[PDB]
Design a protein around this nucleic acid. Structure first.
Ligand SMILES: [Zn+2]
Lengths: 99, 93, 121, 72, 107, 177
RNA sequence: AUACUUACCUUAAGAUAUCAGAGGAGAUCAAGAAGUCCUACUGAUCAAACAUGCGCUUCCAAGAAGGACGUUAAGCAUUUAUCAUUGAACGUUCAUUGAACAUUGAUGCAAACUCCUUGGUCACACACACGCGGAAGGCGUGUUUGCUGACGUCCCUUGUUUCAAUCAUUGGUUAACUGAUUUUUGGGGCCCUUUGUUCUUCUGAGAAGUGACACCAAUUGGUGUUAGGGGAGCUGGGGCCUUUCAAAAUUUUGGAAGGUCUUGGUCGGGUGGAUCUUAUAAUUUUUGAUUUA
């Protein structure tokens, strides 16, 4: 997976931002959160072909300013579903989150 | 009585209008006198037939119910007919 | 067009909106309605009239459509040869701005009547 | 309600275009509040000519427009 | 005795409308006018199998991309040919016409 | 019934065609009419745009230039000069070809404004009713003015020049008159 | 402005919530109509405005949306640039006579550049998940009215923001300290397109004012502007908390009062207008001659 930054958080709420990022990057996972911490940050998750597309980058956003790519620190959930137990991992992560 | 649009057509007297007709003919010329029933009389009329030709009438009188629309000049955009709040100076007695 | 037209508004509430009124011919008029009447004679400010040609109509059949626009500006369309009207753009100035503008228009009108009463004296 | 303003055309040779291709030339003998039109010496012009009798009266529904062929 | 009053009992009801052109319209009535200028929010409108004038009148109304989905359509009365009511609605309730009742008591 | 005239701010007690025609041709109506239309245009030209001008957020700004304001009397004076000059530039047309073709055989059918046949019947019909108290036409031929330089015509007028740059002309023309 | 003269014209009708009772019009015939009509009467639904919410929903910065009635551009491909009569030569060509836009176009396919107008280029932050005030609509609650409106408060500032110093006042703790507010000085940033360097006038930020100003025509006539922000007083609404009273089985509901927060403001009429009925389903817009047979 790859996390992109500076991606113009005031574009949309949920799905129109997933359309505007997929349009300027004309993928199976484009996670974008409305929380204040993850604001101008998003995470797309296709892993080796996604690494090739991340190695292809120079990409600017439809609202304007250029987006910086980066590799994901852990994974997306779709990568963990591709590697598939996992439900117990989701339960443990939720139990750490509510803690 | 009239209502706003035919009052506007009563306003744009003697000024260069363009009429489409239902036939597709778009007469153009100075507007001699419109009536309330939208029968409009025109002068120095230049006409476009549906076939694509152009001719010049002097003095036409096109009936209202075959008008497709009429275009008045631009300035009547700013007209006192459109003023929503102009108060009436004590109607007659 | 995501314009989200007022779900309880008719013509008088639609004033100064940018319309897309459609006729019996299939011609479209686009512009600010500034007035209507009982017979649905509209005025249409800065109006542009678009047809499709007979040839482009073939492409319209079950896409990029070379609509032909002439510019009719301030026109005053008739209620006989129309079909239906919709709304295309919201007006320039918002509801607060329209509201304050109407307040100012009414204050100026009352003032002009005071001046008529003064000149009558 | 208002009777039309054909008073200037009262004796002058006018040319109706009737209906979309009918073109009739006469002299305006009369008009009513509906633009029913009494013409004298109607002479229908096809682009061939055909004369239309002494007097004629033409429905103000069918009449599209009329031109003054005579000078005013 | 006019039946437009019948339609005036039908605000916020979901009908279809077939026009004299051949346009078919689906979407709720917000109101109806005296001479049946019916205003309709949440339309999507369709043209059955074709009429070229109706093809133009369909495409040109925006949001065509042949179902055209439109937020708000006023429709003129002399364009409305026929209007299909919902079958859930009971006609025995609506045709009673309190004006016609009062006129029977006025006689 | 009542026909309110929005310009005159008067009424017509019962609308009919003849009082409408007689009112819309009336000189009082035309005067208040013309005042109003001029008035709307001079308002819209006077009215400043005052856009929002959404100011963006931004090293190389090292150069600084001096603005130039004026006095309030100087402001009002230069604005008055510009008003007069706009009013000139809109109104003025170019004569020349009238003064150029003065002697011509068919000047008096073509440029004498209602002998042209095309606009010709207008200016007779557009003539106002002349109820208050107090043309070179087609008759003119070649043999009216046989020899134009016998009876002295005035010369071709000297061309006009911006007074703002009137100081920068060629001093001392060749060939004195 | 006044007088005189002439010309033209003088009234479409009705209603303004709807339904059911209370009472009236206390119904002119031997106890009673039925109905219909009115109402500061009540109850129910509907409509409109205002206020408040909705942990409503959506949209808000080199690019995105829209447009070019611009070009590259004679870019490339295709098609078309009258009829009739007479004569001659082998349907065609030429000549004569009579009758009635434009090829650099038109149509199709795009593509690119340039240009134009709009927008929270907000506040916060630049980070490893799975914020307030804007704009548009929907829903809910409450008030008010059954159409609408016409006719018969004070003070400060208007380049803004932040930091330090000085002084005044007020509170707390033991003359010292801390916090708040106001004034002055200075510096930094942003901005001055405020394009006339700024609600109007004048002067080169200051001064005055809230009928005046600005301006076009010929003192008269016409149009526009008289603003924006902040605070206080007062008032309206919502939310929370406390007290009291009532009802139901410690809890719930309703009313009142106080405190705190947030948002907003500072009777009549032959009158007209708006909406809806009726003339009005017969040639002029709503009771069909625009699915081309
Ligand atoms: Zn007048």
């Amino acid at each position: 997976e790859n996390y992109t930054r500076l991606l113009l958080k005031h574009i949309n709420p949920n799905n129109k931002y997933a359309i505007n990022p997929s349009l300027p990057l004309p993928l199976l996972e484009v996670s974008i959160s409305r929380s204040s911490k993850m604001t101008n940050q998003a995470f797309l998750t296709f892993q080796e072909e996604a690494d090739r597309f991340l190695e292809k980058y120079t990409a600017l956003k439809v609202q304007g300013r250029k987006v910086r790519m980066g590799k994901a620190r852990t994974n997306s959930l779709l990568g963990x579903x591709x590697x598939x137990x996992x439900x117990x991992x989701x339960x443990x992560x939720x139990x750490x989150x509510x803690x | 009585m009239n209502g706003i649009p035919v009052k506007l057509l009563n306003e744009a007297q003697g000024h260069i209008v363009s009429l489409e007709l239902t036939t597709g003919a778009t007469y153009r010329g100075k507007l001699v006198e419109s009536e309330d029933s939208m029968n409009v009389q025109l002068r120095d009329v230049i006409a476009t037939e549906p076939q694509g030709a152009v001719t010049h009438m002097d003095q036409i009188f096109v009936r209202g119910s075959q008008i497709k629309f009429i275009v008045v000049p631009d300035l009547l955009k700013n007209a006192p007919l459109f003023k929503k709040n102009s108060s009436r100076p004590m109607p007659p007695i | 067009s995501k314009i989200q037209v007022a779900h309880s508004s008719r013509l008088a509430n639609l004033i100064d909106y940018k319309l897309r009124v459609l006729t019996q011919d299939g011609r479209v008029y686009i512009g600010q309605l500034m007035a209507f009447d009982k017979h649905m004679n509209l005025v249409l400010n800065e109006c542009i009239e678009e047809r499709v040609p007979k040839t482009q109509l073939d492409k319209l059949r079950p896409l990029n459509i070379k609509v032909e626009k002439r510019v009719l500006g301030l026109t005053i369309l008739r209620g006989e040869q129309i079909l239906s009207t919709v709304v295309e753009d919201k007006p320039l100035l918002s509801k607060k701005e329209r509201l304050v503008r109407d307040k100012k228009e009414k204050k100026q009108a009352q003032k002009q009547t005071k001046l008529r009463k003064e000149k009558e004296k | 309600v208002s009777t039309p303003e054909l008073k200037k055309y009262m004796d002058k040779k006018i040319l109706l275009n009737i209906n979309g291709s009918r073109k009739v030339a006469g002299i305006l003998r009369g008009y009513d509040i509906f633009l029913n039109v009494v013409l004298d010496d109607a002479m229908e012009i096809n682009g061939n000519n055909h004369q239309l009798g002494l007097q004629t009266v033409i429905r103000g529904n069918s009449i599209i427009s009329l031109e003054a062929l005579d000078a005013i | 005795m006019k039946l437009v009053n019948f339609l005036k009992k039908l605000r916020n009801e979901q009908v279809t409308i077939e026009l004299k052109n051949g346009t078919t319209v689906w979407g709720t009535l917000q109101s109806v006018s005296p001479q049946m200028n019916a205003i309709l929010t949440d339309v999507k409108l369709t043209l059955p199998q074709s009429n070229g004038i109706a093809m133009a009148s369909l495409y040109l109304t925006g949001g065509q991309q042949n179902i055209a989905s439109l937020q708000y359509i006023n429709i003129r009365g002399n364009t409305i040919r026929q209007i299909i009511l919902p079958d859930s609605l009971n006609l025995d309730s609506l045709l009673v016409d309190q004006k016609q009742l009062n006129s029977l008591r006025r006689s | 019934t009542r026909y309110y005239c929005e310009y005159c701010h008067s009424y017509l007690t019962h609308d009919t065609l003849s009082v409408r025609k007689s009112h819309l041709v009336g000189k009082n109506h035309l005067r208040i009419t013309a005042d109003y239309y001029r008035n709307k245009a001079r308002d819209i030209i006077n009215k400043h745009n005052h856009k929002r001008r959404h100011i963006g957020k931004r090293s190389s700004q090292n150069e600084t230039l001096k603005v130039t304001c004026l006095s309030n009397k100087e402001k009002r004076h230069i604005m008055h000069v510009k008003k007069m000059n706009q009013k000139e530039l809109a109104q003025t047309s170019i004569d020349t070809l009238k003064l150029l073709y003065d002697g011509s055989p068919g000047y008096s059918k073509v440029f004498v404004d209602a002998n042209r046949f095309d606009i010709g019947d207008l200016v007779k019909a557009s003539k106002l009713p002349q109820r208050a108290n107090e043309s070179r036409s087609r008759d003119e031929t070649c043999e009216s003015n046989p020899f134009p330089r016998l009876n002295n015509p005035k010369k071709l007028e000297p061309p006009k020049i911006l007074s703002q740059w009137s100081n920068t002309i060629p001093k001392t023309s060749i060939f004195y008159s």
